[PDB]
Enzyme design. Structure first.
Site, short mmCIF file in Angstrom:
data_model
loop_
_atom_site.label_atom_id
_atom_site.label_comp_id
_atom_site.label_asym_id
_atom_site.label_seq_id
_atom_site.Cartn_x
_atom_site.Cartn_y
_atom_site.Cartn_z
N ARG A 1 4.59 -0.74 13.52
CA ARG A 1 5.55 0.20 12.71
C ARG A 1 5.76 1.53 13.02
O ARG A 1 6.96 1.81 13.29
CB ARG A 1 5.01 -0.01 11.39
CG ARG A 1 4.93 -1.15 10.70
CD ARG A 1 4.18 -1.26 9.42
NE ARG A 1 2.72 -1.27 9.43
CZ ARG A 1 2.17 -1.54 8.40
NH1 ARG A 1 2.70 -1.65 6.87
NH2 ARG A 1 0.79 -1.62 8.41
N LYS B 1 0.29 3.40 -2.99
CA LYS B 1 -0.79 4.46 -3.09
C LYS B 1 -0.27 5.82 -3.50
O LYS B 1 -1.05 6.80 -4.28
CB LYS B 1 -1.71 4.34 -1.84
CG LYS B 1 -2.76 3.48 -2.11
CD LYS B 1 -3.57 2.94 -0.97
CE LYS B 1 -4.49 1.68 -0.97
NZ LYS B 1 -3.52 0.33 -0.82
N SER C 1 -6.58 2.97 3.44
CA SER C 1 -5.90 2.01 2.48
C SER C 1 -6.94 1.26 1.58
O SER C 1 -6.80 0.03 1.47
CB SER C 1 -4.82 1.30 3.25
OG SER C 1 -3.86 0.99 2.49
N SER D 1 0.61 -1.37 0.12
CA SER D 1 0.08 0.05 0.11
C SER D 1 0.97 1.39 -0.01
O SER D 1 0.33 2.39 -0.11
CB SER D 1 -0.93 -0.21 1.24
OG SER D 1 -1.91 -1.15 0.73
#
Ligand code: F
Lengths: 251, 251
Positions: A235, A53, A98, A50
């Protein structure tokens, strides 16, 4: 020409504590210096997932596939696994949640030729769009390293990509993740399967973007071996731990 | 033409519990409805003070006085009372720190004629620029009410002001104050003077801007009588207390 790098292995502890392996890559714009825990993995190419994007939104906007950030992409009525996908979106919310089907539709409207041309124009990772036009970033040939993401992000930040300034401003607005009185984070997350090499069932989670400060910009691109599936959580925490450790963002 | 307003005096408690007086004006964009604690004060015009950096930035960018948000306006070497003013700035930091000398220089480059024309084109408050071209918003004839600020802000949000779309996107980026996963606040503070019968000056603090949600925009314009306590901090706190009370932003 010559680029300054600093390897700080001590950041490995932020990954090991969380029973993971990964890389955090930082670029200090003013000082033109990079910092990483792993110079090898900083340079290992993976599916963008993603994080794709960002160029996808840039290309769609530049080609007029997306008119502006407020244009509504109505839900096709097909119930998908993520509840936030099963509703109308604009570019801001499609980035924020997303929403893969919205981006797959942009990809199809863009087409193979223009998608390939644009990725070559962006010097984006390996520039390979092998596979389906609407899924190559999830299960096709496209590969990008953390250092190549920073390279791409730096061009976007400076409005240096070969798309209009407007397209670049709209995408940077859509990337807005966090802001307070100390910093602004403009970033995007990605989660996909490891197809680069034979590493079955494992997942690569990314977080790429930048931290704007009063007087500097800290680009970042990180990736890690996900302990579970499709989510983030860790993350941002590991990256923020590194940014705090490096005295970039306050404690 | 007719504007819908709801008067909710209960917000007065957020003012009184900080030993202050003032007005909070909200506009729900989807519903085209207004909310205030004081319909009289919502319509009382005051000097915009640093809230004038919004039209000032728009005019300067549109006329090419400011090339982009990254252009550096070097410190003129004159030590002023606010430490953050005694340094180099770009449009982002000049807005963030209300760098009055930077904006005074823009004003002088803009000139009376173009400044007047533009404020009439923006239908900005009373459109009066009486006084010095480089200080009229601090000590001249310009007056604006909280409802007139919302009116102006709504045009800016929709890229409806008679300046380029780019100028409007750059100013909205410069207005970025806060963002998290629930909302985005793009706003500007200001602190103006008020003439009192005694011969001295009272201070009137502003906070104007908007709250962007996934599916709505809540414009706000607030002003209050500034006490001898904190100063700035209170404005945001009172506004956020109202936004939380009204269930616009979470706690
Ligand atoms: F100089």
């Amino acid at each position: 020409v010559a680029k300054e790098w600093q390897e700080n292995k001590s950041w490995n502890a932020h990954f090991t504590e969380h029973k993971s392996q990964g890389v955090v890559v930082l670029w200090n714009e003013n000082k033109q210096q990079g910092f990483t825990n792993n110079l090898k993995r900083a340079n290992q190419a993976f599916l963008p997932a993603s994080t794709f994007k960002i160029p996808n939104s840039l290309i769609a906007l530049d080609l007029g596939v997306v008119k502006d950030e407020h244009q509504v992409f109505k839900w096709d009525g097909q119930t998908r696994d993520i509840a936030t996908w099963n509703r109308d979106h604009n570019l801001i919310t499609a980035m924020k949640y997303s929403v893969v089907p919205v981006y797959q539709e942009f990809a199809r409207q863009i087409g193979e030729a223009r998608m390939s041309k644009m990725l070559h124009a962006f010097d984006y990772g390996n520039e390979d769009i092998s596979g389906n036009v609407d899924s190559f970033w999830l299960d096709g040939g496209i590969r990008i390293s953390a250092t190549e993401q920073i390279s791409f992000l730096r061009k976007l930040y400076h409005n240096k990509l070969h798309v209009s300034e407007r397209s670049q401003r709209i995408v940077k607005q859509a990337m807005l993740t966090e802001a307070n009185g100390d910093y602004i984070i403009r970033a995007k997350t990605g989660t996909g399967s490891l197809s680069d090499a034979k590493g079955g069932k494992a997942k690569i989670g990314w977080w790429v973007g930048w931290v704007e400060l009063d007087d500097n910009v800290w680009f970042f691109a990180m990736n890690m071996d996900m302990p579970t599936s499709d989510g983030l959580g860790l993350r941002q925490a590991i990256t923020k731990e590194v940014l705090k450790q490096e005295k970039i963002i306050p404690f």
